[PDB]
């Protein structure tokens, strides 16, 4: 029950923080829902727990939590299992709410995202497109080191895994040939 | 009430610390007032709270807390809202007390400051000048990478937002043309 | 008794974490045993404790904990005691469970391991070999900066001390001639 | 009383830690005395407290705690007060016990020390020399980037302030001419 207690107490700290900065009612309701969707009423010192484990256990855990995400993406499903583990280990779980700008067009992109669950809207000057479970986006800038070619907003609640450009290149340093998978997707999107 | 408790307990740690290092009465009174003005009797693990949020929520919070500061500075008011958010996100809130040397002339400058509320005195060999709400200072060294051209002391209590030279250049890396706003101010001040 | 309490409470956090991610029974049993073997039912803020000490005390502690490991390895036993201390200070204690892949062949190696207690199985295309107390492995890649030449799996429970490639080169920067000890072992293994 | 409580509880964690690693009685007595001399039965989250303050207050505190140390060293007493503050701010308080090797001859030196209180013995092949309150040592390697020219052991309990080579050069980057003070001392010692 110590996990729920930590959540309850922590959220109390949040309410007091929002009250201190006099945040509007609608904004506090948004913060409240984010915490609900993101932690589901439970909190553990994850960093501390995973830090107490060893490489093998941490890799087994991330592989288990991402089993579905993996089987749904040919990128991971047909790849060297060691490549998948290397990738998964670098991912950061993030939750975005409806309407949130995940990626803003024209800005310098330093991360890409894998959709665990949810729907995002991609806008290039017109013609909106949707991406859902099993797809990823934001790879163009990690490859070009340029500026975002489109904006991406969350349509539904989005449970995503982000990957920094540095971690992206680090993993590909060990698995150079996997860069082509990302380039194929980037090329196909740029020629659309 | 957990926010006040944290403050009360933390300040008790401070009193004991000052007692341990045998700090003079006037000095302890100064420390006491700083804590009062800086935290207003409440403390939350801000870093932890903001770290639990996502990019969107953190950006919405800083934009809200700095709404007034922003509208008061043509620098931000007339700029790309994304530039403002990028800037705001890098700021560090700091409180200075009357008489405090914020900037000492002749030293290597590695930060600039935006005045949220308060009055600072700028001294160049003579002719003191005042700056208040809505103005910023310390930009000359961020642009020249040289030495402070004047000293700056807090006149009243000062609620400021500092920006490191590294964060300054990082943001301008994405918004190169905004550097001119700072240069215009630096030029006008150097030619005075 | 505060050390046992910390363990008990921390492990409770683990059980709740594993329950939250719905980990399988066998997996939770594995995690349970790892914690048992790794902490033996006791936990202290080691980093904090050692951080409160000074260089001399920390060096005396690591030398004491590794006295046996040292006397068993000519590498340390016959070396400059200052070299040993420099090395020991960089080691990270790790526990691996039966069947765990400590090193996977073909991957980029960034660490080596010293066996405190346990048996590991080294597999090169065939001909498995065993290494035990007093031996070390993983040195080839720290010297070549290439890819692992063999896989290494824990046979029994393994209590090991790992050394990162950066810490390895850092220590050897001060004790350049000790690199030969590692090269002799790497050469002998590569010519087998 | 919360400062004493933190010490008492923390030291209890230490006793349990030493018991867990089965440290010898004499060693535990040494650890016990170190904690006594170093914290004098009181502990506060100093890093947290100073982190809550601002530049001015932190500088005023370190200047106050080091007032005596400063007036005793012409290096600081006759220097630009801003140079002193810059230096003091980089110092790390450390306590060494009788017989402790502060500096070992022939090793790569990355720090120097200022004696707040205590006596150290400097050994070059023979002719031992003593240094006490108001003196500093270890500057030769910070200037040469070579190897220690002598060993330095604590004679009495030593309350020292260490300065890393990086922080040393950083401060001197802003106060280039102060490097000569250290060179004069290094030259005089090398020609002895
Ligand atoms: N340019 C472009 N990007 C798309 C399209 N569909 C999805 N995207 C993704 O939207 C992302 C926006 O940021 P990036 O430019 O880094 O990468 C882009 C692609 O990953 C498309 O049709 N055209
Ligand atoms: N040199 C100069 N600086 C001024 C003047 N008015 C305000 N300032 C600010 O005082 C600051 C002191 O530090 P910097 O030289 O970095 O930047 C300086 C300016 O931002 C002025 O009239 N002359
Ligand atoms: N190539 C090879 N490695 C061995 C042998 N015996 C033990 N090893 C160790 O197994 C390790 C696997 O990773 P490295 O290639 O870095 O270093 C290897 C050696 O340290 C052997 O016979 N051949
Ligand atoms: N070489 C030398 N060092 C001395 C002497 N007296 C004090 N020392 C200090 O002992 C220190 C040992 O480490 P360093 O060589 O870095 O710097 C040395 C000096 O700071 C002396 O007479 N000769």
Coordinates of N, CA and C in Angstrom, one line a residue, chain A residues 59-154:
Chain A
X59 N 17.1 -5.4 -18.4 CA 16.8 -5.7 -19.8 C 15.6 -6.6 -19.9
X60 N 15.5 -7.5 -19.0 CA 14.3 -8.5 -19.0 C 13.0 -7.7 -18.7
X61 N 13.1 -6.7 -17.8 CA 11.9 -5.9 -17.5 C 11.5 -5.1 -18.6
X62 N 12.4 -4.3 -19.3 CA 12.0 -3.5 -20.4 C 11.5 -4.3 -21.6
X63 N 12.1 -5.5 -21.8 CA 11.7 -6.3 -22.8 C 10.2 -6.8 -22.6
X64 N 9.9 -7.1 -21.3 CA 8.6 -7.6 -20.9 C 7.6 -6.4 -21.1
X65 N 7.9 -5.3 -20.6 CA 6.9 -4.1 -20.7 C 6.7 -3.7 -22.1
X66 N 7.7 -4.0 -23.0 CA 7.5 -3.6 -24.4 C 7.3 -4.7 -25.4
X67 N 6.9 -5.9 -24.9 CA 6.7 -7.1 -25.7 C 5.7 -6.8 -26.9
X68 N 4.6 -6.2 -26.5 CA 3.6 -5.9 -27.5 C 4.0 -4.8 -28.5
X69 N 4.6 -3.7 -28.0 CA 5.1 -2.7 -28.9 C 6.1 -3.3 -29.9
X70 N 6.9 -4.2 -29.4 CA 7.9 -4.8 -30.3 C 7.3 -5.7 -31.4
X71 N 6.5 -6.6 -31.0 CA 5.9 -7.5 -32.0 C 5.1 -6.8 -33.1
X72 N 4.6 -5.6 -32.7 CA 3.8 -4.8 -33.7 C 4.6 -4.0 -34.7
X73 N 5.9 -3.9 -34.4 CA 6.8 -3.1 -35.3 C 7.8 -4.0 -36.0
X74 N 7.7 -4.2 -37.4 CA 8.7 -5.0 -38.1 C 10.1 -4.6 -37.7
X75 N 10.2 -3.3 -37.4 CA 11.5 -2.7 -37.1 C 12.2 -3.5 -36.0
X76 N 11.4 -3.9 -35.0 CA 11.9 -4.6 -33.8 C 11.7 -6.1 -33.9
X77 N 10.5 -6.5 -34.4 CA 10.1 -7.9 -34.6 C 11.1 -8.8 -35.4
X78 N 11.6 -8.2 -36.5 CA 12.5 -8.9 -37.4 C 14.0 -8.6 -37.1
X79 N 14.3 -7.8 -36.2 CA 15.6 -7.4 -35.9 C 16.4 -8.3 -34.9
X80 N 17.7 -8.0 -34.8 CA 18.5 -8.7 -33.8 C 18.0 -8.4 -32.5
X81 N 17.6 -9.4 -31.7 CA 17.1 -9.2 -30.3 C 17.9 -8.3 -29.5
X82 N 19.2 -8.3 -29.7 CA 20.2 -7.5 -29.0 C 20.0 -6.0 -29.4
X83 N 19.7 -5.8 -30.6 CA 19.4 -4.4 -31.1 C 18.2 -3.9 -30.4
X84 N 17.1 -4.7 -30.3 CA 15.9 -4.3 -29.7 C 16.2 -3.9 -28.2
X85 N 16.9 -4.8 -27.5 CA 17.2 -4.5 -26.1 C 18.0 -3.2 -26.0
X86 N 18.9 -3.0 -26.8 CA 19.7 -1.8 -26.8 C 18.9 -0.6 -27.0
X87 N 17.9 -0.7 -27.9 CA 17.0 0.4 -28.2 C 16.0 0.7 -27.0
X88 N 15.3 -0.4 -26.6 CA 14.3 -0.3 -25.5 C 14.9 0.3 -24.3
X89 N 16.2 -0.1 -24.0 CA 16.9 0.4 -22.8 C 17.1 1.9 -22.8
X90 N 17.0 2.5 -24.0 CA 17.2 4.0 -24.1 C 15.9 4.8 -24.1
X91 N 14.8 4.1 -24.3 CA 13.5 4.8 -24.3 C 13.0 5.4 -23.0
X92 N 12.3 6.5 -23.2 CA 11.7 7.2 -22.0 C 10.2 7.2 -22.2
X93 N 9.5 6.6 -21.3 CA 8.0 6.6 -21.3 C 7.5 8.0 -21.1
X94 N 6.6 8.5 -21.9 CA 5.9 9.8 -21.7 C 4.5 9.7 -22.1
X95 N 3.7 10.5 -21.4 CA 2.2 10.5 -21.7 C 1.8 12.0 -22.1
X96 N 1.2 12.1 -23.2 CA 0.7 13.3 -23.7 C -0.8 13.3 -23.7
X97 N -1.4 14.5 -23.5 CA -2.8 14.7 -23.4 C -3.4 15.2 -24.7
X98 N -4.7 15.0 -25.0 CA -5.3 15.5 -26.2 C -5.0 17.0 -26.5
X99 N -4.6 17.2 -27.7 CA -4.3 18.6 -28.1 C -2.8 19.0 -27.9
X100 N -2.1 18.3 -27.2 CA -0.7 18.6 -26.9 C 0.2 18.6 -28.1
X101 N 1.1 19.6 -28.2 CA 2.0 19.7 -29.4 C 3.2 18.9 -29.0
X102 N 3.3 17.7 -29.6 CA 4.4 16.8 -29.3 C 5.6 17.3 -30.1
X103 N 5.4 17.7 -31.3 CA 6.4 18.2 -32.2 C 5.9 19.4 -32.9
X104 N 6.7 20.5 -32.9 CA 6.3 21.7 -33.6 C 7.1 21.9 -34.8
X105 N 6.5 22.1 -35.9 CA 7.1 22.3 -37.2 C 8.1 23.5 -37.2
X106 N 9.3 23.3 -37.9 CA 10.3 24.4 -37.9 C 11.2 24.5 -36.8
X107 N 11.0 23.7 -35.7 CA 12.0 23.7 -34.6 C 13.1 22.7 -34.8
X108 N 14.1 22.8 -34.0 CA 15.2 21.8 -34.1 C 14.8 20.6 -33.4
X109 N 14.7 19.4 -34.1 CA 14.3 18.2 -33.5 C 15.5 17.4 -32.9
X110 N 15.3 17.0 -31.6 CA 16.3 16.2 -30.9 C 15.7 14.9 -30.3
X111 N 14.6 14.5 -30.8 CA 14.0 13.3 -30.3 C 13.0 12.7 -31.3
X112 N 12.7 11.4 -31.2 CA 11.7 10.7 -32.0 C 10.8 10.0 -31.0
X113 N 9.7 9.5 -31.4 CA 8.7 8.8 -30.5 C 8.1 7.6 -31.1
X114 N 7.9 6.6 -30.3 CA 7.3 5.3 -30.7 C 6.0 5.3 -30.0
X115 N 4.9 5.0 -30.8 CA 3.6 5.0 -30.2 C 3.2 3.6 -29.6
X116 N 3.1 3.6 -28.3 CA 2.7 2.4 -27.6 C 1.2 2.3 -27.7
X117 N 0.5 3.4 -27.4 CA -1.0 3.5 -27.5 C -1.4 4.9 -27.7
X118 N -2.3 5.1 -28.7 CA -2.8 6.4 -29.0 C -2.8 6.8 -30.4
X119 N -3.4 8.0 -30.7 CA -3.4 8.6 -32.0 C -2.9 10.0 -32.1
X120 N -2.0 10.2 -33.0 CA -1.4 11.5 -33.1 C -1.8 12.1 -34.5
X121 N -1.9 13.4 -34.7 CA -2.2 14.0 -35.9 C -1.0 14.7 -36.4
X122 N -0.6 14.4 -37.7 CA 0.6 15.0 -38.3 C 0.2 16.0 -39.3
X123 N 0.6 17.2 -39.2 CA 0.3 18.3 -40.2 C 1.5 18.8 -40.9
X124 N 1.5 18.7 -42.2 CA 2.7 19.1 -43.0 C 2.4 20.6 -43.4
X125 N 1.7 22.4 -45.9 CA 0.7 23.3 -45.5 C -0.7 22.7 -45.8
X126 N -1.1 21.7 -45.0 CA -2.4 21.1 -45.2 C -2.3 19.6 -45.3
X127 N -3.4 18.9 -45.4 CA -3.5 17.5 -45.5 C -3.0 16.8 -44.2
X128 N -3.9 16.7 -43.3 CA -3.6 16.1 -42.0 C -3.5 14.6 -42.1
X129 N -2.6 14.0 -41.4 CA -2.5 12.5 -41.4 C -2.5 12.0 -40.0
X130 N -2.9 10.7 -39.8 CA -2.9 10.1 -38.5 C -1.9 9.0 -38.4
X131 N -1.4 8.8 -37.2 CA -0.5 7.7 -36.9 C -1.0 7.1 -35.6
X132 N -0.9 5.8 -35.5 CA -1.3 5.1 -34.2 C -0.4 4.0 -33.7
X133 N -1.0 3.2 -32.9 CA -0.2 2.1 -32.2 C 0.7 1.4 -33.2
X134 N 2.0 1.2 -32.8 CA 2.9 0.5 -33.7 C 3.7 1.4 -34.7
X135 N 3.4 2.7 -34.8 CA 4.1 3.6 -35.7 C 5.1 4.5 -34.9
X136 N 6.0 5.2 -35.5 CA 6.9 6.1 -34.9 C 7.0 7.3 -35.7
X137 N 7.5 8.4 -35.1 CA 7.6 9.7 -35.8 C 8.7 10.5 -35.2
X138 N 9.2 11.5 -35.9 CA 10.2 12.3 -35.4 C 11.6 11.9 -35.9
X139 N 11.7 10.8 -36.7 CA 12.9 10.3 -37.2 C 13.6 11.1 -38.2
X140 N 12.9 11.9 -39.0 CA 13.5 12.7 -40.0 C 14.6 13.7 -39.5
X141 N 14.3 14.4 -38.4 CA 15.3 15.3 -37.8 C 16.5 14.6 -37.2
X142 N 16.3 13.4 -36.7 CA 17.4 12.6 -36.0 C 18.3 12.2 -37.1
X143 N 17.8 12.1 -38.4 CA 18.7 11.7 -39.5 C 19.3 12.9 -40.2
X144 N 18.5 14.0 -40.3 CA 18.9 15.2 -41.0 C 19.6 16.2 -40.1
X145 N 19.3 16.2 -38.8 CA 19.9 17.2 -37.9 C 19.4 18.6 -38.3
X146 N 18.2 18.6 -39.0 CA 17.7 19.8 -39.5 C 16.5 20.3 -38.6
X147 N 15.5 20.8 -39.3 CA 14.3 21.3 -38.5 C 13.1 20.4 -38.8
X148 N 12.2 20.3 -37.8 CA 11.0 19.5 -38.0 C 10.2 19.8 -39.3
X149 N 9.9 18.8 -40.0 CA 9.2 19.0 -41.3 C 7.7 19.0 -41.2
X150 N 7.2 18.8 -39.9 CA 5.7 18.8 -39.7 C 5.5 19.0 -38.2
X151 N 4.3 19.3 -37.8 CA 3.9 19.4 -36.4 C 3.2 18.1 -36.1
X152 N 3.3 17.7 -34.9 CA 2.6 16.5 -34.4 C 1.9 16.8 -33.1
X153 N 0.6 16.6 -33.1 CA -0.2 16.9 -31.9 C -1.0 15.6 -31.5
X154 N -1.1 15.4 -30.2 CA -1.8 14.2 -29.7 C -3.3 14.4 -30.0

